[PDB]
Amino acid sequence: MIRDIIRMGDKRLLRVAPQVTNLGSAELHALVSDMFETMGAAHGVGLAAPQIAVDLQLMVFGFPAVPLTALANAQIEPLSDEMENGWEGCLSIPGLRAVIPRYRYIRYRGFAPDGSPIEREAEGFHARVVQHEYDHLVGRLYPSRIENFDTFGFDDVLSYD
Amino acid sequence: MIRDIIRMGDKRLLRVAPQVTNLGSAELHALVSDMFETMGAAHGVGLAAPQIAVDLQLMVFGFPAVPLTALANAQIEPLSDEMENGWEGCLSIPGLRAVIPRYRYIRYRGFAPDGSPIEREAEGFHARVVQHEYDHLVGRLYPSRIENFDTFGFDDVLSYD
Ligand SMILES: NCCc1ccco1
Ligand SMILES: NCCc1ccco1
Ligand code: NA
Ligand code: NA
């Protein structure tokens, strides 16, 4: 079932989400099923549960190929201080994109919806997607991370390298 | 003649505009005529010449009532340090609004399109409009002035006081 994606300005995108505590349940499997589907209909590469107004530490992402993943109770650590600039957009901020600094190298940990543990090192775009989705879980969106406001603009108009 | 308003992301909104040097001419009167009209069709309270891709120090504004004004070669000074927060939107960033700190009290100076000098003290919303329009002339848009990113969002969704 495709869910409505809420837009920036909605207070529910600004909350810090509680943990998932129904790993392995039929209710979580259906929520995650809904998320992949909603993400797919909107042409996303990541979708966080708060974006469909569900206050949970849960994100789906994937499709340089990133594996399709449902991740609960995500925890992220940088693996060094190297930052890298890259284009980001967000389904809750449609039409826009900016350049954002993210960590080149991360490890992320949590659980697959079935309860099995997930822990991975990620770099580049894989790592950027996870950091962007993780921000949602703590009530943060990308504009508050823009450093060069010349790069922020509408997708069909932008001519910055 | 209604002109197209260019959208954030277009590099022409990022330029520092040269001075108007055709005060009193028929060409300037027609450009200003176009601006009031374009501003009116789009339901604006301010429109700066770079927003219709004209690289000039020129803005129209007006309609708490603000007088309808065409101002060339604007120069602004704060009349104290008091800042005040207030809602801003922009025709080149359609659908969005944020809260922005501006000076409560200003003086602005320049010329009416006919060449006669203009100098005014302004406060509150009058002053905010002029500071926002003036930013355009130096290649600055409002997102780079947001301090509370919780206030930035779509107009039909926002519930912040
Ligand atoms: N759409 C959210 C995922 C994403 C894409 C590019 C950076 O983050
Ligand atoms: N639309 C540009 C003028 C303006 C309106 C509110 C603050 O600035
Ligand atoms: Na918050
Ligand atoms: Na600039």
Side-chain angles (χ1 to χ4, degrees):
Chain A
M1 191 209 315
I2 290 164
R3 314 282 184 102
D4 292 327
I5 296 169
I6 69 172
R7 266 133 27 80
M8 176 174 78
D10 189 308
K11 261 159 177 149
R12 299 166 291 181
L13 287 160
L14 309 179
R15 281 194 290 212
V16 7
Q19 271 188 342
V20 171
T21 60
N22 58 170
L23 302 165
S25 62
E27 299 72 10
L28 182 63
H29 286 273
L31 166 59
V32 167
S33 203
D34 284 5
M35 290 183 63
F36 281 117
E37 189 177 13
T38 297
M39 173 168 95
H43 298 226
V45 306
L47 182 69
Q51 293 178 269
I52 60 166
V54 176
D55 190 19
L56 289 184
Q57 289 175 33
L58 180 68
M59 65 177 67
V60 290
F61 59 88
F63 62 91
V66 166
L68 284 162
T69 309
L71 183 64
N73 303 334
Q75 274 166 212
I76 287 173
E77 344 164 42
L79 295 190
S80 80
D81 282 326
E82 205 174 359
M83 306 300 277
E84 195 174 76
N85 290 127
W87 288 107
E88 291 189 28
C90 181
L91 309 165
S92 299
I93 312 162
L96 289 149
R97 56 180 232 257
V99 170
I100 307 297
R102 299 282 190 191
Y103 290 106
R104 210 223 281 207
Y105 299 124
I106 72 177
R107 178 172 302 110
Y108 61 90
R109 299 174 195 280
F111 301 81
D114 75 1
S116 52
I118 283 168
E119 80 69 27
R120 287 172 192 170
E121 288 74 43
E123 80 182 297
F125 190 72
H126 184 173
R128 157 179 317 274
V129 175
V130 174
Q131 302 166 65
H132 172 125
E133 293 317 319
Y134 176 85
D135 282 344
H136 287 304
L137 310 183
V138 298
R140 188 131 203 225
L141 301 141
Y142 77 71
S144 63
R145 293 195 185 270
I146 298 172
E147 284 167 2
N148 185 353
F149 279 91
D150 281 9
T151 69
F152 188 29
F154 290 91
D155 178 55
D156 60 342
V157 173
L158 266 167
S159 68
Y160 194 98
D161 276 48
Chain B
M1 191 209 315
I2 290 164
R3 314 282 184 102
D4 292 327
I5 296 169
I6 69 172
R7 266 133 27 80
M8 176 174 78
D10 189 308
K11 261 159 177 149
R12 299 166 291 181
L13 287 160
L14 309 179
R15 281 194 290 212
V16 7
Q19 271 188 342
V20 171
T21 60
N22 58 170
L23 302 165
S25 62
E27 299 72 10
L28 182 63
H29 286 273
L31 166 59
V32 167
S33 203
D34 284 5
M35 290 183 63
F36 281 117
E37 189 177 13
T38 297
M39 173 168 95
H43 298 226
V45 306
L47 182 69
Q51 293 178 269
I52 60 166
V54 176
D55 190 19
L56 289 184
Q57 289 175 33
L58 180 68
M59 65 177 67
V60 290
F61 59 88
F63 62 91
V66 166
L68 284 162
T69 309
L71 183 64
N73 303 334
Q75 274 166 212
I76 287 173
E77 344 164 42
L79 295 190
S80 80
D81 282 326
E82 205 174 359
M83 306 300 277
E84 195 174 76
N85 290 127
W87 288 107
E88 291 189 28
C90 181
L91 309 165
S92 299
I93 312 162
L96 289 149
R97 56 180 232 257
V99 170
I100 307 297
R102 299 282 190 191
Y103 290 106
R104 210 223 281 207
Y105 299 124
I106 72 177
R107 178 172 302 110
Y108 61 90
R109 299 174 195 280
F111 301 81
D114 75 1
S116 52
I118 283 168
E119 80 69 27
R120 287 172 192 170
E121 288 74 43
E123 80 182 297
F125 190 72
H126 184 173
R128 157 179 317 274
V129 175
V130 174
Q131 302 166 65
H132 172 125
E133 293 317 319
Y134 176 85
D135 282 344
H136 287 304
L137 310 183
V138 298
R140 188 131 203 225
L141 301 141
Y142 77 71
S144 63
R145 293 195 185 270
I146 298 172
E147 284 167 2
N148 185 353
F149 279 91
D150 281 9
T151 69
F152 188 29
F154 290 91
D155 178 55
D156 60 342
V157 173
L158 266 167
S159 68
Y160 194 98
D161 276 48

